[PDB]
A paper describes a structure:
Attachment of ubiquitin (Ub) to cell surface proteins serves as a signal for internalization via clathrin-mediated endocytosis (CME). Here, we show that additional components of the endocytic machinery including CALM, HIP1R, and Sla2 bind Ub via their N-terminal ANTH domain, a domain belonging to the superfamily of ENTH and VHS domains. ANTH domains are part of the larger family of ENTH (Epsin N-Terminal Homology) and VHS (Vps27, HRS, STAM) domains that are found in the N-terminus of proteins that play a variety of roles in endocytosis and many bind Ub (Moshkanbaryans et al., 2014; Takatori and Tomita, 2019).
We obtained a crystal structure of the CALM ANTH domain in a complex with Ub that we verified with NMR and mutagenesis experiments. Structural studies revealed that Ub binds with µM affinity to a unique C-terminal region within the ANTH domain not found in ENTH domains. Mapping the chemical shift perturbations from HSQC experiments with 15N-Ub bound to the CALM ANTH domain onto the ANTH:Ub crystal structure showed that the residues undergoing the largest changes were located at the interface captured in the crystal structure. The largest PRE effects from the HSQC of 15N-Ub resulting from binding to CALM spin-labeled at residues 209, 268, and 284 were mapped onto the CALM:Ub structure and confirmed that in solution, Ub bound the same region and orientation as observed in the crystal structure. We mutated residue F223, since it sits within the hydrophobic interface with Ub, and mutated residues D224 and D276, which make electrostatic interactions with R42 and K48 of Ub. Although wildtype CALM-ANTH caused significant chemical shift perturbations within the 15N HSQC spectra, no perturbations were observed when F223 was altered to Ser or Ala alone or in combination with altering D224R or D276A. These results were confirmed in GST-pulldown experiments using GST fused to five tandem copies of linear Ub that bound the wildtype CALM ANTH domain but not a mutant ANTH domain carrying the F223A single substitution or the combined F223S and D224R double substitutions. In this structure, the v-SNARE helix sits in the same region as the C-terminal helix of CALM (residues 261–276).
Numbering used by the authors:
A (entry chain A): 19 to 286
B (entry chain B): 1 to 74
The structure:
């Protein structure tokens, strides 16, 4: 309890480095123990986003992101239930040149964690942690849920690509640590997105005339997002990331629009 | 000749054919290389589902053309 709040502060010192593994692994340990005051923990991290240093604020967001990905699901569930999550729409650290540069990136990253939280609330599971493959969640979803679900994947994606950082702006250990977590979410979210699309394209040719309209707009959007995902993956390539970890987007079903349009034409 | 078949999961198949081979025969050869029962194979080219009795030449499928395979429910 007193130890939690103190490890939160250790994760979020003014040291210009990402949160330390020892403090992040302890916090993960916390979330999983039986009598955790999850609200109190979350509360301590929000409190550190009220701070005026960009270093503190951005490391508190990174820790929260880290804990949504690796912490007990109970942590992401609480964040998604809250009324207000991160209120950093006006954040600005005028202290120096780094503060000025890193304040736009704090505003964007805070927006992305809020969307991640809303995404979880709207479908009640984490797109980046559900069973993959031909019997996974997104491949086997039934038609109604699929059509309501794939748009929520797309809105999370869009908020991730809005961080919109160039490789030559990843100039300190804080923003890089955020970047690497954004990268991890992106490839897992794209995997969930490509899988929903596969399913959609399979079902499309037995769908009703007005489900093909919903599905056709989902797909058109999938194609525009893929051009922007490839730009983000080029930043990843530039920074030096293992190229076997970058998805090959040429494998996505990206050339079927014509088939989907002629088939909607025939349905009229 | 050589044609390609791209599945929705991303694999690209290479198949040996002749322009006269029926779409039904082309599906049977996809059975032989990938295991997919022909009755679950939608083949698509130039935006149209390809009919079993028509031939590759009836659809303008020549060398190095890529067909799309979409799996279907019986």
């Amino acid at each position: 309890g007193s130890a939690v709040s103190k490890t939160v502060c250790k994760a979020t010192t003014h040291e210009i480095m990402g949160p330390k593994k020892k403090h992040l692994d302890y916090l993960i340990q916390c979330t999983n123990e039986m009598n955790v005051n999850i609200p109190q923990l979350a509360d301590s991290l929000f409190e550190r986003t009220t701070n005026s240093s960009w270093v503190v604020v951005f490391k508190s967001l990174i820790t929260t992101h880290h804990l949504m990905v690796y912490g007990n699901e109970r942590f992401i569930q609480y964040l998604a239930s809250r009324n207000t999550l991160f209120n950093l729409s006006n954040f600005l650290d005028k202290s120096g040149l780094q503060g000025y540069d890193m304040s736009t990136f704090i505003r964007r990253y805070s927006r992305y964690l809020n969307e991640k939280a809303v995404s979880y609330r709207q479908v009640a599971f984490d797109f980046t942690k559900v069973k993959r493959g031909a019997d996974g969640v997104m491949r086997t979803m039934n038609t109604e849920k699929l059509l309501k679900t794939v748009p929520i994947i797309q809105n999370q994606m869009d908020a991730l690509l809005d961080f919109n950082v160039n490789s030559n702006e990843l100039t300190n250990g804080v923003i890089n640590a955020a970047f690497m977590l954004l990268f991890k979410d992106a490839i897992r979210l794209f995997a969930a997105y490509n899988e929903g699309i596969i399913n959609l394209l399979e079902k499309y040719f037995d769908m009703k005339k007005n489900q093909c309209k919903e599905g056709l707009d989902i797909y058109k959007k999938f194609l525009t997002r893929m051009t922007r995902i490839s730009e983000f993956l080029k930043v990843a390539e530039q920074v030096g990331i293992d190229r076997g970890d970058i998805p090959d987007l040429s494998q996505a079903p990206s050339s079927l629009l014509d088939a989907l349009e002629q088939h909607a034409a025939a349905l009229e | 000749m050589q044609i390609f078949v791209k599945t929705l999961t991303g694999k690209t198949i290479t198949l040996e054919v002749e322009p006269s081979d029926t779409i039904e025969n082309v599906k049977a050869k996809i059975q032989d290389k990938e295991g997919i029962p022909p009755d679950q194979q939608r083949l698509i080219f130039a935006g149209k589902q390809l009919e079993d009795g028509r031939t590759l030449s009836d659809y303008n499928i020549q060398k190095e053309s890529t067909l799309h395979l979409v799996l279907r429910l019986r």
